[PDB]
Amino acid sequence: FVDGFDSANSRLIANLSYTMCISRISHYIKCVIRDKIGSIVDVESIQKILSDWISEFVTTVYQPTPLEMARYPFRNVSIEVKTIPGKPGWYSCKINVIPHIQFEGMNTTMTIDTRLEPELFGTNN
């Protein structure tokens, strides 16, 4: 792709390790929210239960060592649920998760600049 964002999307989706994690959210929704299937809830209530959970797994700060940080898979999440017309008791969620992007490689160009410290190679001396 040309657009940078689109190009990055496809790079994260191909990555298995994330779809393993995003899958674990499906095992949360269709598993736990089943309990409150009859309870009276709202657009603002489902956004609470579903967010209050995942919130303990999202950070920006990095912890020392890999293990102590891998506790936090995701970086940040949006959860915009909203009721639909017609069906009164039905809803339609739409989450979006940005996982902590892993290292994958890097190029590097070394060079003798001799321009960094001009005090040693400059004209004025």
Add this chain to the structure above:
Amino acid sequence: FVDGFDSANSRLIANLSYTMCISRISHYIKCVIRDKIGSIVDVESIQKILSDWISEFVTTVYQPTPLEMARYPFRNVSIEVKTIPGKPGWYSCKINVIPHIQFEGMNTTMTIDTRLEPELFGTNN
């Protein structure tokens, strides 16, 4: 009857409890006004004596509890007396009383509208 007023007339006349009350006015006229049978009185004077009495028994406001309100049987009354030709000392009254109409029953249609609060079922959301 077709005419609504006429239909309501016959509904109140059949009602015994009123004819008991309207009867108590007859026991007032042919009983009390007998005192001033020889006194000099007028069309405007008989309308006073007969009205000043019944006036304490006519209201529109409702009192708490049934008993405290049943003190007032009638709602409103007209009293149009008028002298007749020929007989000078004779008159001819014509009162008309509307008693406090009692409860008698009611129908009721319950329904789930779902149109009362469109903020929850409307399209715009």
